[PDB]
Structure formats: structure tokens, C-alpha cells
Coordinates of N, CA, C and O and ligand atoms in Angstrom, one line a residue:
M1 N -10.1 9.5 19.5 CA -9.2 9.2 18.8 C -8.9 9.6 17.8 O -9.8 10.0 16.6
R2 N -7.4 9.8 17.3 CA -7.2 10.5 15.9 C -7.7 9.1 14.7 O -7.0 8.0 15.0
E3 N -8.0 9.5 13.6 CA -8.6 8.8 12.7 C -7.2 9.2 11.3 O -7.1 10.0 11.3
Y4 N -6.9 7.8 10.9 CA -6.1 8.2 9.8 C -6.9 7.5 8.2 O -7.4 5.9 8.8
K5 N -6.7 8.1 7.7 CA -7.5 7.5 6.2 C -6.4 7.1 5.4 O -5.7 7.8 4.3
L6 N -6.2 5.9 5.0 CA -5.2 5.2 4.3 C -5.5 4.6 3.1 O -6.9 4.1 3.0
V7 N -4.8 4.7 2.1 CA -5.3 4.2 0.5 C -4.1 3.2 0.3 O -3.2 3.6 0.0
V8 N -4.7 2.2 -0.2 CA -3.8 1.0 -0.9 C -3.8 1.3 -2.0 O -4.9 1.0 -2.8
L9 N -2.9 1.3 -3.1 CA -2.9 1.4 -4.6 C -1.5 0.7 -5.2 O -1.0 -0.1 -4.6
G10 N -2.1 0.3 -6.5 CA -1.2 -0.5 -7.1 C -2.0 -1.3 -8.5 O -3.5 -1.1 -8.2
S11 N -1.4 -2.1 -9.1 CA -2.1 -2.7 -10.5 C -2.6 -3.9 -9.9 O -2.2 -4.4 -8.7
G12 N -3.2 -4.6 -10.7 CA -4.1 -5.4 -10.1 C -3.3 -6.6 -10.0 O -2.1 -7.3 -10.8
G13 N -3.7 -7.4 -9.3 CA -3.1 -9.0 -8.7 C -1.7 -9.0 -7.7 O -1.2 -9.7 -7.5
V14 N -1.6 -7.7 -7.3 CA -0.5 -7.6 -6.3 C -0.2 -7.9 -5.0 O 0.7 -8.3 -4.2
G15 N -1.7 -7.9 -4.8 CA -1.9 -8.4 -2.8 C -2.6 -7.4 -2.3 O -2.4 -7.5 -1.2
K16 N -3.0 -6.2 -3.1 CA -3.6 -5.0 -2.1 C -4.8 -5.4 -1.4 O -4.7 -5.0 -0.2
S17 N -5.8 -6.3 -1.6 CA -6.9 -7.3 -0.9 C -6.1 -7.8 0.3 O -6.6 -8.0 1.0
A18 N -5.3 -9.1 -0.5 CA -4.8 -9.8 0.4 C -3.9 -8.9 1.9 O -4.2 -9.5 2.5
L19 N -3.2 -7.9 1.6 CA -2.6 -7.4 2.5 C -3.7 -6.6 3.3 O -3.7 -6.7 4.5
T20 N -4.4 -5.9 3.1 CA -5.7 -5.0 3.4 C -6.3 -6.4 4.7 O -6.4 -5.8 5.6
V21 N -6.8 -6.9 4.0 CA -7.5 -8.1 4.7 C -6.4 -9.1 6.0 O -7.3 -9.1 7.0
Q22 N -5.6 -9.2 5.6 CA -4.4 -10.0 6.7 C -4.4 -9.0 7.4 O -4.5 -9.3 8.9
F23 N -4.0 -7.5 7.6 CA -4.2 -6.6 8.3 C -5.0 -6.4 9.0 O -5.2 -6.4 10.7
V24 N -6.4 -6.5 8.7 CA -7.4 -5.8 9.4 C -8.1 -7.1 10.1 O -9.0 -7.1 11.3
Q25 N -8.3 -8.1 9.4 CA -9.0 -9.2 9.5 C -8.1 -10.3 10.1 O -9.0 -11.5 10.9
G26 N -6.8 -10.5 10.1 CA -6.1 -11.4 10.2 C -6.3 -13.0 9.6 O -5.9 -13.8 10.0
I27 N -6.5 -12.9 8.3 CA -6.7 -14.2 7.3 C -6.1 -13.7 5.8 O -6.6 -12.7 5.7
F28 N -6.0 -14.8 5.1 CA -5.5 -14.8 4.0 C -6.5 -15.2 2.9 O -7.1 -16.2 3.0
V29 N -6.9 -14.2 2.3 CA -8.0 -14.3 1.3 C -7.9 -15.5 0.3 O -9.0 -16.0 -0.2
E30 N -6.7 -16.2 -0.1 CA -6.6 -17.0 -0.7 C -7.1 -16.5 -2.0 O -6.7 -15.4 -2.5
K31 N -8.2 -16.8 -2.9 CA -8.9 -16.5 -4.0 C -9.7 -15.2 -4.0 O -10.1 -15.0 -5.0
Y32 N -10.6 -15.2 -2.9 CA -11.3 -14.3 -2.7 C -10.6 -12.8 -3.1 O -10.0 -12.3 -2.9
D33 N -11.6 -12.2 -4.0 CA -11.4 -11.1 -4.9 C -12.3 -10.5 -4.6 O -13.5 -10.0 -5.3
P34 N -12.8 -9.4 -3.4 CA -13.4 -8.5 -3.3 C -13.9 -7.5 -4.5 O -14.9 -7.2 -4.5
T35 N -12.8 -6.9 -5.5 CA -13.5 -5.9 -6.5 C -14.8 -5.1 -6.5 O -15.1 -4.3 -7.1
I36 N -15.5 -4.8 -4.8 CA -16.0 -3.5 -4.6 C -14.8 -2.8 -4.0 O -14.0 -3.3 -3.2
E37 N -14.5 -1.5 -4.2 CA -13.4 -0.9 -3.6 C -13.8 -0.4 -2.0 O -14.4 0.7 -1.7
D38 N -14.2 -1.2 -0.6 CA -14.1 -1.0 0.3 C -13.3 -0.3 1.1 O -12.0 -0.5 1.0
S39 N -13.9 0.2 2.3 CA -12.8 0.6 3.6 C -12.9 -0.5 4.3 O -14.2 -1.1 4.9
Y40 N -11.8 -0.7 5.0 CA -11.9 -1.7 6.2 C -11.4 -0.7 7.5 O -10.4 0.0 7.2
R41 N -11.9 -1.2 8.5 CA -11.4 -0.2 9.8 C -10.5 -1.5 10.9 O -11.2 -2.2 11.0
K42 N -9.6 -0.6 11.7 CA -9.0 -1.7 12.7 C -8.2 -0.3 13.6 O -7.9 0.7 13.0
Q43 N -8.4 -0.2 14.8 CA -7.9 0.5 15.7 C -6.4 -0.2 16.4 O -6.5 -1.3 16.7
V44 N -5.4 0.6 16.2 CA -4.0 0.1 16.6 C -3.5 0.9 17.4 O -3.5 2.4 17.8
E45 N -2.2 0.4 18.0 CA -1.3 1.5 18.9 C -0.3 1.4 17.9 O 0.6 0.2 17.7
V46 N 0.4 2.6 17.8 CA 1.8 3.0 17.1 C 2.2 3.7 17.8 O 2.1 5.0 18.0
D47 N 3.5 3.3 18.3 CA 4.6 4.2 19.0 C 3.9 4.6 20.1 O 3.7 6.0 20.6
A48 N 2.7 4.0 20.8 CA 2.3 4.4 22.2 C 1.2 5.9 21.9 O 0.8 6.3 22.7
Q49 N 0.7 5.7 20.6 CA -0.5 6.4 20.3 C -1.6 5.7 20.0 O -1.4 4.8 18.7
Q50 N -2.7 5.6 20.4 CA -3.9 5.2 20.0 C -4.1 5.9 18.5 O -4.4 6.7 18.2
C51 N -4.6 5.1 17.3 CA -4.9 5.2 16.1 C -5.9 4.6 15.7 O -6.1 3.1 15.7
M52 N -6.9 5.2 15.5 CA -8.1 4.3 14.3 C -7.8 4.4 12.7 O -7.8 5.5 12.3
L53 N -7.7 3.5 12.4 CA -7.0 3.4 10.9 C -8.4 2.7 10.0 O -9.3 1.6 10.2
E54 N -8.9 3.8 9.1 CA -9.7 3.5 7.8 C -8.8 3.3 6.6 O -8.1 4.0 5.9
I55 N -9.0 1.8 6.1 CA -8.1 1.6 5.1 C -8.9 1.3 3.5 O -9.6 0.5 3.8
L56 N -9.2 2.1 2.6 CA -9.3 2.0 1.4 C -8.6 1.2 0.6 O -7.7 1.3 0.4
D57 N -9.4 -0.1 0.0 CA -8.8 -0.8 -0.7 C -9.1 -1.1 -2.3 O -10.4 -1.2 -2.4
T58 N -8.4 -0.3 -3.1 CA -8.9 0.2 -4.1 C -8.9 -1.0 -5.3 O -7.7 -2.2 -5.1
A59 N -9.5 -0.6 -6.2 CA -9.0 -1.8 -7.7 C -8.1 -1.5 -8.2 O -7.3 -0.2 -8.1
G60 N -7.2 -2.4 -9.0 CA -6.2 -2.1 -9.6 C -6.1 -1.0 -10.4 O -7.3 -0.4 -11.1
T61 N -5.1 -0.3 -10.9 CA -4.8 1.1 -11.6 C -5.4 0.7 -13.1 O -6.1 1.7 -13.5
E62 N -5.6 -0.5 -13.4 CA -5.8 -0.8 -14.6 C -7.7 -0.7 -14.8 O -8.0 -0.1 -16.0
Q63 N -8.0 -0.7 -13.8 CA -9.4 -0.9 -13.8 C -10.4 0.2 -13.6 O -9.9 1.5 -13.0
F64 N -11.6 0.7 -14.2 CA -12.6 1.4 -13.8 C -12.9 2.1 -12.8 O -13.4 0.4 -11.6
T65 N -12.8 3.3 -12.3 CA -13.4 3.7 -10.8 C -13.5 5.1 -11.3 O -12.3 5.8 -11.4
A66 N -14.7 5.7 -10.9 CA -14.7 7.2 -11.0 C -14.2 8.1 -9.8 O -14.5 9.3 -10.0
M67 N -13.6 7.2 -9.0 CA -13.4 7.9 -7.7 C -12.1 8.2 -7.3 O -11.1 8.6 -6.2
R68 N -11.2 7.9 -8.5 CA -9.6 7.8 -8.6 C -9.1 9.3 -7.8 O -8.5 9.4 -6.7
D69 N -9.4 10.4 -8.3 CA -8.9 11.6 -8.2 C -9.5 11.8 -6.6 O -8.4 12.7 -6.1
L70 N -10.6 11.7 -6.5 CA -11.0 11.9 -5.1 C -10.4 11.1 -4.0 O -9.9 12.0 -3.1
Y71 N -10.0 9.6 -4.4 CA -9.5 8.9 -3.6 C -8.0 9.2 -3.2 O -7.5 9.8 -2.2
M72 N -7.2 10.3 -4.1 CA -6.1 10.4 -4.2 C -5.7 12.0 -3.5 O -5.1 12.2 -2.6
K73 N -6.6 12.9 -3.7 CA -7.0 14.1 -2.7 C -7.3 13.8 -1.4 O -6.7 14.3 -0.9
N74 N -8.0 13.0 -1.3 CA -8.3 12.9 0.1 C -7.6 11.9 1.0 O -7.8 12.0 2.4
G75 N -7.2 11.0 0.5 CA -6.2 10.2 1.3 C -5.1 10.9 1.9 O -4.3 11.9 1.3
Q76 N -5.0 10.4 3.2 CA -3.9 11.0 4.3 C -2.7 10.1 4.0 O -1.4 10.8 4.2
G77 N -2.6 9.0 3.5 CA -1.3 8.4 3.1 C -1.4 7.1 2.3 O -2.5 6.7 2.0
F78 N -0.6 6.8 1.6 CA -1.0 6.0 0.6 C 0.2 4.8 0.5 O 1.4 4.8 0.6
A79 N -0.2 3.5 0.5 CA 0.9 2.5 0.1 C 0.6 2.1 -1.2 O -0.7 1.7 -1.9
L80 N 1.8 2.1 -1.7 CA 2.1 1.7 -3.3 C 2.6 0.2 -3.3 O 3.9 0.0 -3.0
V81 N 1.6 -0.5 -3.8 CA 2.2 -2.1 -3.5 C 2.3 -2.6 -4.8 O 1.7 -2.4 -6.2
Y82 N 3.3 -3.4 -5.3 CA 3.7 -4.0 -6.4 C 4.3 -5.2 -6.0 O 4.2 -5.8 -4.6
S83 N 4.0 -6.3 -7.0 CA 4.8 -7.7 -6.5 C 6.1 -8.0 -7.2 O 6.4 -7.7 -8.3
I84 N 7.1 -8.7 -6.4 CA 8.1 -8.6 -6.5 C 8.4 -9.8 -7.8 O 9.5 -9.9 -8.1
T85 N 7.4 -10.5 -8.0 CA 7.7 -11.3 -9.0 C 6.9 -10.9 -10.8 O 6.6 -11.4 -11.6
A86 N 6.5 -9.1 -10.9 CA 6.4 -9.1 -12.0 C 6.7 -7.4 -12.1 O 6.5 -6.6 -11.5
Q87 N 7.6 -7.3 -12.7 CA 8.4 -5.8 -13.0 C 7.2 -4.9 -13.7 O 7.4 -3.8 -13.5
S88 N 6.4 -5.6 -14.1 CA 5.3 -4.3 -14.7 C 4.7 -3.7 -13.6 O 4.3 -2.7 -13.8
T89 N 4.3 -4.3 -12.6 CA 3.5 -3.8 -11.4 C 4.5 -2.8 -10.5 O 4.0 -1.9 -10.0
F90 N 5.7 -3.0 -10.8 CA 6.8 -2.2 -10.2 C 6.9 -0.9 -10.9 O 6.5 0.2 -10.3
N91 N 7.3 -1.1 -12.3 CA 7.1 0.1 -13.1 C 5.4 1.0 -13.2 O 5.9 2.2 -13.0
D92 N 4.8 0.4 -13.3 CA 3.4 0.8 -12.7 C 3.2 1.8 -11.7 O 2.4 2.9 -11.8
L93 N 3.9 1.8 -10.9 CA 4.3 2.7 -9.6 C 4.3 4.1 -10.0 O 4.3 5.2 -9.3
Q94 N 5.2 4.2 -10.7 CA 5.9 5.4 -10.9 C 4.7 6.3 -11.4 O 4.7 7.6 -11.0
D95 N 4.0 6.1 -12.5 CA 2.8 6.9 -12.8 C 1.6 7.0 -11.9 O 1.3 8.1 -11.6
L96 N 1.4 6.0 -11.1 CA 0.8 6.2 -9.9 C 1.1 7.3 -9.1 O 0.3 8.1 -8.8
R97 N 2.2 7.2 -8.7 CA 2.9 8.4 -7.9 C 2.5 9.4 -8.1 O 2.2 10.7 -7.5
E98 N 3.2 10.0 -9.6 CA 2.9 10.9 -10.0 C 1.7 11.6 -10.4 O 1.3 12.7 -10.2
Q99 N 0.6 10.8 -10.4 CA -0.9 11.3 -10.5 C -1.3 11.6 -8.9 O -1.9 13.0 -8.9
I100 N -0.9 11.2 -8.1 CA -0.8 11.4 -6.8 C -0.6 13.1 -6.3 O -1.0 13.8 -5.8
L101 N 1.1 12.9 -6.8 CA 1.3 14.1 -6.4 C 0.8 15.5 -6.9 O 1.0 16.5 -6.8
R102 N 0.0 15.1 -8.4 CA -0.2 16.2 -9.4 C -1.6 16.5 -8.4 O -1.8 17.8 -8.4
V103 N -2.5 15.6 -8.1 CA -3.7 16.0 -7.6 C -3.5 16.5 -6.1 O -3.8 17.7 -5.9
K104 N -2.3 16.2 -5.4 CA -2.1 16.7 -4.1 C -1.4 18.2 -4.3 O -1.3 19.0 -3.4
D105 N -0.6 18.6 -5.5 CA 0.0 19.3 -5.7 C 1.0 19.9 -4.9 O 1.4 20.9 -4.3
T106 N 1.9 18.6 -4.3 CA 2.9 18.6 -3.8 C 3.7 17.4 -3.6 O 3.3 16.5 -4.0
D107 N 4.9 18.0 -3.4 CA 5.9 16.5 -3.2 C 5.9 15.4 -2.2 O 6.4 14.4 -1.8
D108 N 5.5 16.2 -0.4 CA 5.3 15.8 0.3 C 4.1 15.1 0.8 O 3.3 15.8 1.7
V109 N 4.0 13.9 0.3 CA 2.7 13.1 0.7 C 3.0 11.9 1.3 O 3.9 11.2 0.8
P110 N 2.5 11.4 2.4 CA 2.9 10.3 3.3 C 2.7 9.2 2.2 O 1.4 9.0 1.7
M111 N 3.4 8.1 1.9 CA 3.6 7.2 1.3 C 4.3 6.0 1.8 O 5.5 6.1 2.2
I112 N 4.6 4.6 1.5 CA 5.2 3.8 1.7 C 5.1 2.8 0.2 O 4.0 2.6 -0.2
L113 N 6.1 2.3 0.0 CA 6.4 1.5 -1.1 C 6.9 -0.2 -0.6 O 7.7 -0.2 0.2
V114 N 5.9 -1.0 -0.9 CA 5.5 -2.0 -0.9 C 6.0 -3.1 -1.8 O 5.2 -3.3 -2.5
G115 N 7.3 -4.1 -1.6 CA 7.3 -5.2 -2.7 C 6.6 -6.3 -1.8 O 7.2 -6.9 -1.1
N116 N 5.4 -6.6 -2.6 CA 4.5 -8.0 -1.9 C 5.0 -9.1 -2.6 O 5.8 -9.0 -3.4
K117 N 4.8 -10.3 -1.8 CA 4.9 -11.5 -2.4 C 6.3 -11.9 -1.9 O 6.8 -12.9 -3.0
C118 N 6.8 -11.7 -1.0 CA 8.1 -12.0 -0.6 C 8.4 -13.6 -0.4 O 9.6 -14.3 -0.5
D119 N 7.4 -14.1 0.0 CA 7.4 -16.1 -0.2 C 7.6 -16.2 -1.5 O 8.0 -17.4 -1.4
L120 N 7.5 -15.7 -2.5 CA 7.9 -16.0 -3.6 C 9.1 -15.9 -4.3 O 9.3 -15.6 -5.4
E121 N 10.0 -15.9 -3.5 CA 11.3 -15.4 -3.7 C 12.0 -16.1 -4.9 O 12.7 -15.2 -5.8
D122 N 11.7 -17.7 -4.9 CA 11.9 -17.9 -6.6 C 11.6 -17.7 -7.7 O 12.2 -17.9 -8.8
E123 N 10.1 -17.0 -7.6 CA 10.1 -16.0 -8.7 C 10.5 -14.6 -9.2 O 9.7 -14.1 -9.6
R124 N 11.1 -14.4 -8.0 CA 11.4 -12.8 -8.1 C 11.9 -12.2 -9.3 O 12.9 -13.1 -9.9
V125 N 11.2 -11.2 -9.9 CA 12.0 -10.4 -11.1 C 12.5 -9.0 -10.9 O 13.0 -8.4 -11.3
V126 N 11.9 -8.6 -9.6 CA 12.3 -7.4 -9.0 C 13.2 -7.1 -7.9 O 13.1 -7.9 -7.1
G127 N 14.4 -6.7 -8.2 CA 15.4 -6.9 -7.1 C 15.0 -6.1 -6.0 O 14.5 -5.1 -6.0
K128 N 15.5 -6.2 -4.6 CA 15.2 -5.4 -3.7 C 15.9 -4.2 -3.6 O 15.4 -3.0 -3.2
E129 N 17.2 -4.4 -4.0 CA 18.0 -3.0 -4.7 C 17.0 -2.2 -5.5 O 17.0 -0.7 -5.5
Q130 N 16.2 -2.6 -6.4 CA 15.7 -2.0 -7.5 C 14.4 -0.9 -6.7 O 14.2 0.0 -6.9
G131 N 14.1 -2.0 -5.2 CA 13.0 -1.4 -4.6 C 13.6 -0.2 -3.9 O 12.8 1.2 -3.8
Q132 N 14.6 -0.3 -3.3 CA 15.3 0.7 -2.2 C 15.6 2.0 -3.1 O 15.8 3.2 -2.7
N133 N 15.8 1.5 -4.4 CA 16.2 2.5 -5.3 C 15.2 3.3 -5.9 O 15.3 4.7 -5.8
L134 N 13.8 3.1 -5.9 CA 12.8 3.5 -6.1 C 12.6 4.5 -5.2 O 12.1 6.0 -5.3
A135 N 12.6 4.2 -3.8 CA 12.1 5.0 -2.7 C 13.0 6.0 -2.7 O 12.6 7.1 -2.4
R136 N 14.5 5.7 -3.1 CA 15.3 7.0 -2.9 C 15.0 7.9 -3.7 O 15.4 9.1 -3.7
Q137 N 14.6 7.7 -5.0 CA 14.3 8.9 -6.2 C 13.3 9.8 -5.5 O 13.0 10.7 -6.2
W138 N 12.2 8.8 -4.8 CA 10.7 9.9 -4.2 C 11.3 10.4 -3.1 O 10.6 11.0 -2.4
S139 N 12.6 10.6 -2.7 CA 13.1 10.9 -1.3 C 12.1 10.4 -0.2 O 11.8 11.2 0.8
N140 N 11.9 9.0 -0.3 CA 10.9 8.4 0.5 C 12.0 7.6 1.7 O 12.0 6.8 1.1
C141 N 11.5 7.7 2.6 CA 12.3 7.5 3.7 C 11.8 5.8 4.2 O 12.6 5.0 5.2
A142 N 10.9 5.5 3.7 CA 10.2 4.0 3.9 C 10.1 3.0 2.8 O 9.1 3.1 1.7
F143 N 10.5 2.1 2.9 CA 10.6 0.7 1.9 C 10.3 -0.6 2.5 O 11.5 -1.1 3.5
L144 N 9.5 -1.3 2.3 CA 9.4 -2.6 2.7 C 9.2 -3.8 1.8 O 8.2 -3.4 0.7
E145 N 8.8 -5.2 2.1 CA 8.9 -6.2 1.2 C 8.1 -7.0 2.4 O 8.4 -7.1 3.3
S146 N 6.9 -7.2 1.8 CA 6.1 -7.9 2.4 C 5.5 -9.3 2.1 O 5.9 -9.6 0.7
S147 N 4.7 -10.0 2.9 CA 4.1 -11.4 2.3 C 2.5 -11.3 3.2 O 2.9 -11.7 4.5
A148 N 1.4 -11.1 2.4 CA 0.3 -11.3 2.9 C 0.2 -12.6 3.1 O -0.5 -13.0 4.0
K149 N 0.8 -13.7 2.8 CA 0.3 -15.3 2.7 C 1.2 -15.6 3.7 O 0.6 -16.2 4.7
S150 N 2.6 -15.1 4.1 CA 3.3 -15.8 5.2 C 3.1 -14.3 6.2 O 3.6 -14.8 7.4
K151 N 2.6 -13.8 5.9 CA 2.6 -12.3 7.3 C 3.7 -12.1 7.8 O 4.0 -11.9 8.8
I152 N 4.3 -11.5 7.0 CA 5.7 -10.9 7.1 C 5.8 -9.4 6.5 O 5.2 -9.2 5.3
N153 N 6.1 -8.5 7.7 CA 5.9 -7.0 7.4 C 4.1 -6.9 7.0 O 4.5 -5.6 6.6
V154 N 3.5 -7.3 7.3 CA 1.9 -7.0 7.3 C 1.5 -5.4 7.8 O 1.0 -4.9 7.5
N155 N 1.8 -5.9 9.2 CA 1.3 -4.8 10.2 C 2.2 -3.8 9.9 O 1.6 -2.7 9.9
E156 N 3.5 -4.0 9.5 CA 4.2 -3.0 9.7 C 4.3 -1.9 8.4 O 4.7 -0.8 8.6
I157 N 3.5 -2.4 7.3 CA 3.0 -1.6 6.4 C 2.5 -0.2 6.7 O 2.6 1.0 6.3
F158 N 1.5 -0.6 7.5 CA 0.5 0.3 8.1 C 0.7 1.0 9.1 O 0.2 2.0 9.3
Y159 N 1.5 0.7 9.9 CA 2.1 0.9 11.3 C 3.1 2.1 10.6 O 3.4 3.1 11.1
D160 N 4.0 1.5 9.7 CA 5.1 2.8 9.1 C 4.5 3.8 8.2 O 4.6 4.8 8.1
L161 N 2.8 3.8 7.6 CA 2.2 4.4 6.9 C 1.6 5.4 7.8 O 1.8 6.7 7.6
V162 N 1.4 4.8 9.3 CA 0.8 5.9 10.1 C 2.1 6.5 10.6 O 1.9 8.1 11.1
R163 N 3.3 6.5 10.9 CA 4.4 7.2 11.5 C 4.7 8.1 10.0 O 5.2 9.2 10.2
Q164 N 4.7 8.0 8.9 CA 5.1 8.8 7.9 C 4.0 10.1 8.1 O 4.2 11.0 7.6
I165 N 2.6 9.4 8.4 CA 1.7 10.7 8.2 C 1.9 11.8 9.6 O 1.7 12.4 9.5
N166 N 2.5 10.7 10.9 CA 1.9 11.7 12.1 C 3.9 12.1 12.4 O 4.1 12.3 13.2
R167 N 4.9 11.9 11.5 CA 6.0 11.8 11.7 C 6.3 13.2 12.6 O 6.0 14.6 12.2
Ligands
GDP201 N1 2.3 -16.0 -2.8 C1 1.8 -15.3 -2.3 N2 0.4 -14.5 -2.9 C2 -0.5 -13.9 -2.7 C3 0.0 -12.7 -1.9 N3 -0.8 -11.8 -1.9 C4 -2.0 -11.9 -2.6 N4 -1.7 -12.9 -3.5 C5 -2.4 -13.5 -4.1 O1 -2.1 -12.9 -5.6 C6 -3.7 -12.9 -6.0 C7 -4.0 -11.7 -5.8 O2 -4.7 -11.0 -4.5 P1 -5.3 -9.8 -4.4 O3 -5.1 -9.4 -2.7 O4 -6.8 -10.3 -4.8 O5 -4.7 -8.5 -5.3 P2 -5.1 -7.2 -5.4 O6 -5.8 -7.2 -7.2 O7 -4.3 -6.4 -5.8 O8 -6.1 -6.6 -4.7 C8 -4.6 -13.9 -4.9 O9 -4.3 -15.4 -5.7 C9 -3.9 -13.9 -3.8 O10 -3.9 -15.3 -3.1 C10 1.5 -13.2 -1.2 O11 1.6 -12.2 -0.4 N5 2.1 -13.9 -1.3
MG202 MG1 -8.1 -6.3 -4.7

């Protein structure tokens, strides 16, 4: 079976772990905070093709890890996650995308931009159009808003990332 090495990136507290665990294990972490950078495995079918996914759930961009450039070089596709309730987490993604492009030395890198915590619409500070606009600037043709808590678009993040990889 074809294996896909996916990497989930973004600033602290946006729901990287929550999205990864909801996808792979089908449960919501609540307050559980892995802070090991573990890999999680799940087999799926995307567009009638069997896929074995390995998903690396990274620590926040703010935090120490001696493995970041390695993660970026070796990752086949990247989910760049922000929270719709924190503008800083959205703006932080611009530098992380640039770091990936620098390491890969190319602009053509499978990526999905993800605005998480859509269930906190009442606390939204990042517009959906702003997210759509950032993906546009990246010439990236995949953008989603999600909720790890409400299970909205969780599977679709990873399915769409697989699609960007095997386009
Ligand atoms: N309301 C809501 N809370 C979320 C969501 N995703 C994560 N959380 C919560 O936000 C906090 C941080 O989540 P976590 O997965 O640890 O973020 P990480 O630092 O990016 O790995 C936790 O309290 C989570 O329960 C979501 O989609 N909706
Ligand atoms: Mg985490």
C-alpha cells in the first residue's frame, strides 16, 4: 500500500493534536496535551485508492524541537493550522510556509491551509475570506475551516492533503 508522510504544523494551541487525534482515533482530546511529537497511523481510502497515512503532530512553532528542518524536508504534505479565534496564529503561518519552501527549495509543495475551531464562530477574529485570500497568495488550491471538537472537516483535511500529494 502507498504510504503518505503528513506533517501537521502551526502555533501552539490551535488544535494540531486535537485534529490529529480526532482523525486517527475518533476522539476529542479535551485538555490532553501530548507535547511528545508523535506520529499517528491510519489507513483510509481516498478517491478509490488505498492510502496508509502517517501523521506527525508537531509541537507549536514557538517551542523547541531539534527536528524541524528534518520534518520539513521529509514531509510529503503539510497541514498548516491556525485558529479562527487568534489572528497571531494565522499570521504565524506565513513564516512557517516560507521555512518549508526554503527547505524544499521549491514552491510546489503539497499543503492545506486549515482554520480550526469553527465551533467558536462567536469568538472569530480571522475572516474566512482572509483564509481564502492567504491560500490564494500561496497559489494553493486547498483551504478548509474545521472543528476538532464538532468533527467538522476533520477527515477532509487529511483526504484533501492526500489529494494535493497525489494530484
Ligand atoms: N472549541 C474547540 N476547542 C479546540 C478545538 N481544537 C482544539 N481545541 C482545544 O484547544 C486547546 C489546544 O488544543 P491542542 O490540540 O492541544 O493544540 P496544539 O497545541 O495545536 O496541539 C485544547 O484545550 C483543545 O481542547 C476545536 O476545534 N474547537
Ligand atoms: Mg499539540
